[PDB]
């Protein structure tokens, strides 16, 4: 249902294209951000456009917005999947996965590990050496 898909993307684009000329400029991007409680500098506004402007003409057109929007979507889907799985491991939602927590989910996965085996797993991902795995350390282990 691309047709319906493009429609939703067109809708998003129009929010930024304040004057409707078919392009988004630094100033238009600027008014959108400011309405969000963010007052970026012209320098920051230029870096944002630079990242998305494939033909280097200085503005973003629909096709350029579409391709970036897409790639961004895919990525937002990744993050929320990993964040979901983090919540399942962090049985007490304290923000960190302990040895005991990791060992209990592992048994549920069909792997009966000893405390020493779980401790080794934690150690491998434990960057701040606090004996637990935080989200940052979890994504590192996940992705990498
Ligand atoms: Ca415009
Ligand atoms: Ca462009
Ligand atoms: Ca926890
Ligand atoms: Ca840690």
Swiss-Prot record:
PANTHER family: CALMODULIN LIKE 3, MYOSIN LIGHT CHAIN 1, 3
Name of this protein: Calmodulin-1
Keyword Protein biosynthesis: no
Residues the record lists as Phosphothreonine modifications: 41, 107
Residues that hold Ca(2+) 4 according to the record: 126, 128, 130, 132, 137
Organism classification: Eukaryota, Metazoa, Chordata, Craniata, Vertebrata
Native species: Homo sapiens (Human)
Modification(s) after translation: Ubiquitination results in a strongly decreased activity. Phosphorylation results in a decreased activity.
Glycyl lysine isopeptide (Lys-Gly) (interchain with G-Cter in ubiquitin) cross-link, renumbered residues: 18
Positions bearing N6,N6,N6-trimethyllysine: 112
């Amino acid at each position: 249902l691309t047709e319906e898909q493009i429609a939703e993307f067109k809708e998003a684009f129009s929010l930024f294209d304040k004057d409707g000329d078919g392009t988004i400029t630094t100033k238009e991007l600027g008014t959108v951000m400011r309405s969000l409680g963010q007052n970026p500098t012209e320098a920051e506004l230029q870096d944002m456009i630079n990242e998305v402007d494939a033909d280097g003409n200085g503005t973003i057109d629909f096709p350029e917005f579409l391709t970036m929007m897409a790639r961004k979507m895919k990525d937002t889907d990744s993050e929320e999947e990993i964040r979901e799985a983090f919540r399942v491991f962090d049985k007490d939602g304290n923000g960190y996965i302990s040895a005991a927590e990791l060992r209990h989910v592992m048994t549920n996965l069909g792997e009966k590990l000893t405390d020493e085996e779980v401790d080794e797993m934690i150690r491998e991902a434990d960057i701040d050496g606090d004996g637990q795995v935080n989200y940052e350390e979890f994504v590192q282990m996940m992705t990498a």
